[model samples]
Target: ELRVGLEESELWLRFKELTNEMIVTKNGRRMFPVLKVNVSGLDPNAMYSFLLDFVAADNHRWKYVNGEWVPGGKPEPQAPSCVYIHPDSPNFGAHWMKAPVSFSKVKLTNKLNGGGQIMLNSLHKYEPRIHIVRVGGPQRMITSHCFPETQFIAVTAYQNEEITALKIKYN
Candidate 1:
């Protein structure tokens, strides 16, 4: 397939549909649509670690006041530091692609370590981005913003947040 193909875009759009269709319930619900990434373009004979990180859409993340979400009025506070490992970090490229797709939908967290409603303004909107990084010997990284099967629901809190046991996949 060409570098720019429907495969990637289609996946991204499908993910969007999933996001729009599902509402982040008051307690939150597991993503009905899963983001299964079929990745390629890696070198063998390398160790890699897969990690996920969430980034703020813009300068203003959000503001909360009086039991409700409101405009922060000021720039967002500094974001927490994060690191995402490339899915292929364990086995780069061809071999990594040989297996079934990996990585679950990126989760929106409210807890410091990934807990809570995700917390946001009521009428305000937000966007989430996913990144893939490669770690280990002969360091190589590939960051992609597109993952079609992925979707997220906005909620004021995180009661039934989703979990995929990524640690199992890596270990």
Candidate 2:
């Protein structure tokens, strides 16, 4: 069976306690407690590719009030879905298993015209998804995984002071 596990989950749970918030700028923002994962049960000689995309965690908009997040109202129209393909794609599964895959380089943006960054709506909650695809396999297959602990509210400038503080201490 193909299996995947969250790497550095201890740290991710720490930020989850603060209700993780990710900054989204026109220039794109890097995700902290970045998506790092381990995988197993793949054909050693088969090629594979990894990708990431964000999906709204809910339908409500959020606001920072009283140092905490609250459902403000309806969210803005969803943004165009975009995916970030790992640069090291279509590679042998052996190499993929050689080390934990890290996605610190993937960036998020709120700008409609931003090039190549995963587009997100500000004040919206999101859960980034991990996708694995078997390249040129006899049978087409794709597996997607979601980590609830990595869920966050997308923002231009972080609205919560506590989230900001923790990011600073650990960044």
Candidate 3:
């Protein structure tokens, strides 16, 4: 059996609250939030897993054409993909819901060696999405919208003051 709802847990609620607070800086800041889902909508005797991956924006090499940023041509070279996992995983039935474990603090790296602010090219756009997985059961679950995707944005956009305010409210 399976179930779903819009009911958010304490961790998710915290995400909202953190988003509500101002970042107040130009440098990178990790989200002080987590997704503490009270996942009762599962088979107690079954196994479960978590997966986190980012979908790069489809179009590439946008240039200011006419009066707007237009796709210059074809897709550009692909960047090294990295899948972030929850720091604390493998929690059994009782272990998971005991408290809101924080997997919210992810790397915002932007270095050739992967360091400092999420590695995104300026003026280019990207969106981040989170996914949940269930294992040890015959029924394979796939939800494209399991987690909402953040809006597209450029890394070096000087309008970050506006962006920072937006993050605290929207995501």
Candidate 4:
């Protein structure tokens, strides 16, 4: 069995109010308020690996105007998803529960053709998900989790002024 919990709920709520956004550049951009969490209910003697990925939240494009998000139109076809496999893989569960897990190394990019970058559409909503995988022996087990509080819209440019203000204020 596996269980997971978000690491920074208070911080995440602060950002979520302004509608959390990640600026995706052709060069790729790292996620701010990066996905972090804690895990438990795993076999302590087993090794585990963590993976991160982003998926479209809805099939509609979004527009941020008048300090809010609205449906713009049909969303552009999304590109192939890229998953960020945590480098500290196959570590004991004891080690995982020792501290909060952070996926700060994961990044988002709008580049249609590139390696090692999570492809996402600008002006569209997406959810960041985490997967915990058993790393050793045959028949490895996998468990995935997503937090609604961590959902955000991906953008190439800041669509809302409040978002920009928050970024400047805290970032």
Maximum-lDDT candidate? 2
Q: Candidate 4 has what TM-score?
A: 0.89
Q: Please, what are the lDDT tens digits per residue for candidate 1 over residues 97-150? A: 565444343343333344433333332334434454556657566565543334
List clash counts for every candidate, in order.
15, 0, 4, 0
Tens digit per residue, CA lDDT, model 3, 1-171: 344332343334443332222121245445423333334444545555544444556557544444344555677765743555555544453454445334465544334343333454544544445444555568855432343323243443323343455445546
- What are the clashing pairs of model 4? none
Residues 1-171, candidate 2, lDDT per residue (tens digit)? 999999988888888888899988888888887899999998889999998888888878888888878996555566546889987887899988989988888888888664667788888888878889998879878999988878998888878788888888887
lDDT values, one for every candidate: 0.41, 0.85, 0.44, 0.81
Model 3 regions lying over 4 Å from their true place: 1-40, 61-74, 77-80, 93-102, 112-122, 133-149, 157-160, 167-171
- The candidates, ranked best first by lDDT, are 2, 4, 3, 1
What is the full ranking by TM-score, best candidate first? 2, 4, 3, 1
RMSD of each: 8.7, 1.6, 6.8, 2.0
Choose the strongest candidate by TM-score: 2
Q: Which of the two, 1 or 2, has more TM-score?
A: 2
Off by over 4 Å in 2: 75-80
Model 4 C-alpha lDDT versus the unseen true structure: 0.81
